[PDB]
Design a protein around this ligand. Sequence first.
Ligand SMILES: [Mg+2]
Ligand SMILES: [Mg+2]
Ligand SMILES: [Mg+2]
Ligand SMILES: [Mg+2]
Ligand SMILES: [Mg+2]
Ligand SMILES: [Mg+2]
Ligand SMILES: [Mg+2]
Ligand SMILES: [Mg+2]
Ligand SMILES: [Mg+2]
Ligand SMILES: [Mg+2]
Ligand SMILES: [Mg+2]
Ligand SMILES: [Mg+2]
Ligand SMILES: [Mg+2]
Ligand SMILES: [Mg+2]
Ligand SMILES: [Mg+2]
Ligand SMILES: [Mg+2]
Ligand SMILES: [Mg+2]
Ligand SMILES: [Mg+2]
Ligand SMILES: [Mg+2]
Ligand SMILES: [Mg+2]
Ligand SMILES: [Mg+2]
Ligand SMILES: [Mg+2]
Ligand SMILES: [Mg+2]
Ligand SMILES: [Mg+2]
Ligand SMILES: [Mg+2]
Ligand SMILES: [Mg+2]
Ligand SMILES: [Mg+2]
Ligand SMILES: [Mg+2]
Ligand SMILES: [Mg+2]
Lengths: 187, 52, 52, 124, 147
Amino acid sequence: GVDIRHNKDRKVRRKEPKSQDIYLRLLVKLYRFLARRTNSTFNQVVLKRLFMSRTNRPPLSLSRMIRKMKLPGRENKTAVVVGTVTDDVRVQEVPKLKVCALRVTSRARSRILKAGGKILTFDQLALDSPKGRGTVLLSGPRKGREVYRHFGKAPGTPHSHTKPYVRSKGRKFERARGRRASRGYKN
Amino acid sequence: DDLYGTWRKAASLKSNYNLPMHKMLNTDLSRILKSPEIQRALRAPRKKIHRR
Amino acid sequence: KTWRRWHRRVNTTQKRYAICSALAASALPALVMSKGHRIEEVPELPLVVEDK
Amino acid sequence: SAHLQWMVVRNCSSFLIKRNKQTYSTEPNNLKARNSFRYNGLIHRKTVGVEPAADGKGVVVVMKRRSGQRKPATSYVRTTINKNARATLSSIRHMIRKNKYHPDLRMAAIRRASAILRSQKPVM
Amino acid sequence: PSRLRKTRKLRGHVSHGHGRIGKHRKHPGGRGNAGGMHHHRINFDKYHPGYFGKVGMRHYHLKRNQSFCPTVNLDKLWTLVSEQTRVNAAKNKTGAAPIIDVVRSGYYKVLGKGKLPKQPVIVKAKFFSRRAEEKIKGVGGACVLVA
RNA sequence: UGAAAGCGGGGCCUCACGAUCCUUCUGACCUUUUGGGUUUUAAGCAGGAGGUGUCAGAAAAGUUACCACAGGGAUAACUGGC
RNA sequence: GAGAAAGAGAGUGGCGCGGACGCUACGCCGCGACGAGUAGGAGGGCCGCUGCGGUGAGCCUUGAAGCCUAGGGCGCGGGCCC
RNA sequence: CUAACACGUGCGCGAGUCGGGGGCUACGAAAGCCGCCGUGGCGCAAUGAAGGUGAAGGCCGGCGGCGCGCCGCCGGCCGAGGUGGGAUCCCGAGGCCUUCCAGUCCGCCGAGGGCGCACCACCGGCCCGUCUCGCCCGCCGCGCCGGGGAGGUGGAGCACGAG
RNA sequence: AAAUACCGGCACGAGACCGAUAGUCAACAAGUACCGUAAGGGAAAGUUGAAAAGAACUUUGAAGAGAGAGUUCAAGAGGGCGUGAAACCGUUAAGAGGUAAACGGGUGGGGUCCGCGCAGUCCGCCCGGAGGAUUCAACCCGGCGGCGCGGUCCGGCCGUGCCG
Ligand SMILES: [Mg+2]
Ligand SMILES: [Mg+2]
Ligand SMILES: [Mg+2]
Ligand SMILES: [Mg+2]
Ligand SMILES: [Mg+2]
Ligand SMILES: [Mg+2]
Ligand SMILES: [Mg+2]
Ligand SMILES: [Mg+2]
Ligand SMILES: [Mg+2]
Ligand SMILES: [Mg+2]
Ligand SMILES: [Mg+2]
Ligand SMILES: [Mg+2]
Ligand SMILES: [Mg+2]
Ligand SMILES: [Mg+2]
Ligand SMILES: [Mg+2]
Ligand SMILES: [Mg+2]
Ligand SMILES: [Mg+2]
Ligand SMILES: [Mg+2]
Ligand SMILES: [Mg+2]
Ligand SMILES: [Mg+2]
Ligand SMILES: [Mg+2]
Ligand SMILES: [Mg+2]
Ligand SMILES: [Mg+2]
Ligand SMILES: [Mg+2]
Ligand SMILES: [Mg+2]
Ligand SMILES: [Mg+2]
Ligand SMILES: [Mg+2]
Ligand SMILES: [Mg+2]
Ligand SMILES: [Mg+2]
């Protein structure tokens, strides 16, 4: 007999992507090699972010791309997301960028290549910098989805600003007893 | 190429279509792994089996 | 019942992705023989014949 | 390329057969006849195949050239070796080694040619 | 696909994933949304506050077409008109401001959220925010009304 | 109120009390009353009260030996047990 | 595999034609610790049935499906092959 | 099994997205196509019962307004928060020997120091309702008109998309 | 009038449907047989074989039913007859038997079949002994293929490259 519990004995991570497309799995076959035979911890983060889900790879937009590139120090540096560099239309000027992503929106490709930057993908990033030397890794807003507004401390409860699941927003749809001091009680 | 477009000419016989871009371009993984750009920046391959 | 959901609707862009992939894989020699067509005496398998 | 069409062929090919917890592959230019990446003959640019001859005796050796990849009729060149068992194997060894032609299959082709010639010398 | 579903793994298990003590009975809590104020009050007040009661004025023959007034923000104001107009506005030394009819794009009201780039405009709309029209004045440009 | 420091938004402290819907009263030179305007009226918004003592709140008399059904040894009328 | 952060680094000046296996990378290999289980949850099935699109130049009157068996067997097992 | 909803996953596109209704041209009642068929749905904006309103600012020069050294209005400029933690990266005091010294290039290690992703916590800021305090501005109608600020407070908000 | 609806009727076609306890109640002399006074309730039930070639004739018995003979590829398809499982039963063979039978672990004994057991593996390299070949290496001619990359040979084609 051994006095240990087995509740968390199985760690819960991914070790392969749940996707079944072959180009992503060739990227995985490349970065498995580049993560265990380099001492760069960039390749482990790229390998771990290739496994992740669509909701764990949120799209990073172009006006946040350029904004996080306009910080000092990180000039003429390539810059890497693992998700999708979408266009942002509420920005007019666009500097030249060295972007490296899995899939870039066609309008964002036109926007970047018009400004004169270049768009690598990951098999080109491996040839350009195997240890990831001189990169800026970025990621989209992971709490950007609307389902992280329904989460947390429940409504009908003091100091909990949670959007409740309501079938149609109006004045008749959950405004009346929990929501008012006049009728019932306020939270 | 008139129907399904080209990589820079769009689809003439559809309305607004263009071929979907690749997720990686150089696909031949053997030449990427056997390349002097990468083979320089690797540690030593330890392959001595150390049994019990 | 008869009102089982018999049909499925697919997005137009990935309906087009699918036939682009089918056409593009019908040009590789390994992906046709593995499909099974005995082909080994064909002159070139992206095979264009006279318009006549 | 090669690694995409391997990941297409690897579970979906008509040459693959799977029974009795054993996996095989029946493409004509396969050495050791097993489903793997090194041995599959339809995929690569350069490929060695060993077949018994159209005659009852002799070993034909199949070499995939580099130019007509998409051209299947003018891609594979045949050479027939109807000789003694030692010089047949030295011929196949010189063709694979000294031409730098896909050197991982250098011993598997010699094993296969040695297994063909044993079947061609008469039954006990 | 029933081949992938749960019931293919629950053959042989004599309760089929619903328990031996509490059997899978038919309707143990009432049908539907039953018992709002009686025995599911804890759920309807921990998770749907405001669900019971009346509030506000009853408006009988409401028509969603009288109150049609869609909005657009100033940071996507220039996305209405093609890029050549604003490029030529940046290149023009005359001071000729481009004219942008938001109603032609399909937005009646202009609200002002974002930074608006510094070149003039004639923005014509059906309504305006206070901050939107003064952002248009701050870039220097006119707010034309239209009915 | 005390001169003042201060004390006091009920009872020295521990109990003395009540949701939605509905009604009534109070409030603002308030909102709506639907094509426009005026005036009544009604609807609203905010704050009390009318009360659910089964007190998180159905509106509610019996009898069956003519009885019925689904169940319960979760539960009495026998023995047996302690 | 070596107790000690890092180059089996480049540069300038004083005969015999030979070398096993491998790597379905979803693959293969190496160490360590562990294995109870009802209600329940999840994973893997090259476990099984019926039909459909592909495929095996599949099988079959020189005898398919079914059924029987003191025959030979494999798999922890569902089952399966002779 | 049908429908609705929720979340997790895979796929296409992406501030958009979708033809499902209609139409045009054996298998095929399929498949393709429309784009001045995006009507429409969902999303890109919230808040209020409602009339409604509807999501940064900062600096300079001039003109007890004086017993806004604080701007009413204009000309110019910077421009879209901060603090802590933060995977990644960037810089590099020194050093990784072959006989020793000077000595370049490539790679690597590293004291210390940065620019800090996502996210979390906190402080700010903006929009809508409400309350309090208070002064100033606008004109085609100078009115029971309209606009504005400061300080709390109610919101399923904004704060460089994520559907 | 048109666009619209149609589990009834006439005439069609089709099916990722069911395959005789399924699919209509009904694959058949089915709303038939049968039950009820009545309103109404309402089944079970497919398959010899390629072709009846459906067993002439002999013999026992009164006959059903046999024994021979014959048809057929087959009666191990004989008029409710393809296949013919299970429970249950008859008989033969083997084995056993006083704690009802049955079961798990462990062997032992007897069977039944299989190994086509019953003088036991081959495979490379070297040495020796006897052999037999139209015989190797090097050269010459022809064909085919691969690439220190011809540092930089000539000519093409392409760029999800640029410029004029
Ligand atoms: Mg143990
Ligand atoms: Mg356990
Ligand atoms: Mg666990
Ligand atoms: Mg269980
Ligand atoms: Mg359950
Ligand atoms: Mg039970
Ligand atoms: Mg229950
Ligand atoms: Mg219970
Ligand atoms: Mg239930
Ligand atoms: Mg109650
Ligand atoms: Mg006070
Ligand atoms: Mg009137
Ligand atoms: Mg009585
Ligand atoms: Mg009873
Ligand atoms: Mg008693
Ligand atoms: Mg267990
Ligand atoms: Mg749920
Ligand atoms: Mg999801
Ligand atoms: Mg809707
Ligand atoms: Mg048809
Ligand atoms: Mg039947
Ligand atoms: Mg039957
Ligand atoms: Mg029937
Ligand atoms: Mg029957
Ligand atoms: Mg029968
Ligand atoms: Mg027969
Ligand atoms: Mg028969
Ligand atoms: Mg029979
Ligand atoms: Mg006996």
